[PDB]
Amino acid sequence: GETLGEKWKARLNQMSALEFYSYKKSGITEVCREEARRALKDGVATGGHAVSRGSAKLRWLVERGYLQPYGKVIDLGCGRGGWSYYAATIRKVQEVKGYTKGGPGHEEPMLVQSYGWNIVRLKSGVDVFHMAAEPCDTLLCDIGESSSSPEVEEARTLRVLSMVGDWLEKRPGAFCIKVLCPYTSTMMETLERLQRRYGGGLVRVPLSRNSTHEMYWVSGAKSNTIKSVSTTSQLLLGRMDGPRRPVKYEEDVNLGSGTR
Ligand SMILES: Nc1ncnc2c1ncn2[C@@H]1O[C@H](C[C@@H](N)CC[C@H](N)C(=O)O)[C@@H](O)[C@H]1O
Numbered sequence: 001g002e003t004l005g006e007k008w009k010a011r012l013n014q015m016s017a018l019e020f021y022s023y024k025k026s027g028i029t030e031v032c033r034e035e036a037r038r039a040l041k042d043g044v045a046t047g048g049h050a051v052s053r054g055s056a057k058l059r060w061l062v063e064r065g066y067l068q069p070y071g072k073v074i075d076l077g078c079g080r081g082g083w084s085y086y087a088a089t090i091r092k093v094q095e096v097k098g099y100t101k102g103g104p105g106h107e108e109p110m111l112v113q114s115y116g117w118n119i120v121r122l123k124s125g126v127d128v129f130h131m132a133a134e135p136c137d138t139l140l141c142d143i144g145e146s147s148s149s150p151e152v153e154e155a156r157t158l159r160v161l162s163m164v165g166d167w168l169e170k171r172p173g174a175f176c177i178k179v180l181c182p183y184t185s186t187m188m189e190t191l192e193r194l195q196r197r198y199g200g201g202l203v204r205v206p207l208s209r210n211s212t213h214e215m216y217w218v219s220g221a222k223s224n225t226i227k228s229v230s231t232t233s234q235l236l237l238g239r240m241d242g243p244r245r246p247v248k249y250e251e252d253v254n255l256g257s258g259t260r
Pocket residue numbers: 051052053054055076077078079080081082083084099100101102106107126127128129142143144
């Protein structure tokens with residue numbers, strides 16, 4: 001019947017504005033973005049700043065061995081490009097190709113000169129659901145829009161996963177795919193099938209806010225899908241009770257500067 005994550009989602013939808021604001025960041029990990037946010041507002045491109053919070057999330061996965069990027073990196077839904085810029089600093093990465101929709105309401109690629117910027121091409125105006133898949137060594141995808149409806153989250157995740165499949169058939173050796181909604185019975189069954197075909201596992205990145213159940217399907221992970229999902233649901237539900245817990249900070253990403 002009802003999964004733990006579905007219980008989490010229903011309770012999230014019952015929170016007041018104050019409860020939601022306090023719960024959102026209770027006990028999460030975070031980078032302080034004040035220094036980067038000013039620079040990028042001033043139009044600076046050489047301070048080594050990440051363009052987005054996304055860089056810290058991919059760094060977390062890469063630094064803990066869940067993903068080893070190499071060769072040709074594709075970044076689907078690159079937005080401003082936080083994942084692409086981080087990938088460009090990795091020694092074995094040869095090229096980074098990012099694709100994002102852009103337009104009103106959506107994020108545009110940011111052009112900065114952090115280390116390895118010269119091996120990057122960020123392309124806006126691309127709907128990846130209509131782009132032909134091509135071969136690559138590392139496949140990245142950070143697509144999926146949050147919704148108050150778990151029904152919507154499931155459907156958006158399935159669309160992403162069907163699109164990702166065509167790229168995985170080009171047989172990349174590494175991948176990191178956002179799974180917005182892993183917590184429904186259909187989604188757990190879907191990811192068991194995908195795990196059987198392509199390997200990998202699901203990982204909860206602790207920089208994710210408590211207001212999303214997003215997990216990342218990464219090639220270096222092996223965990224049982226149901227256990228990893230249910231563990232994350234338990235964590236998120238427990239944080240809804242008791243007092244607010246402090247945010248834990250890591251230092252923001254410094255990607256350096258220069259060319260490769
Ligand atoms: N069908 C789509 N095609 C291309 N881009 C999309 C599509 N749907 C959503 N997006 C974009 O994917 C991006 C998702 C971002 N959260 C990714 C953040 C990125 N990883 C970073 O570090 O900056 C958003 O900018 C979306 O506008």
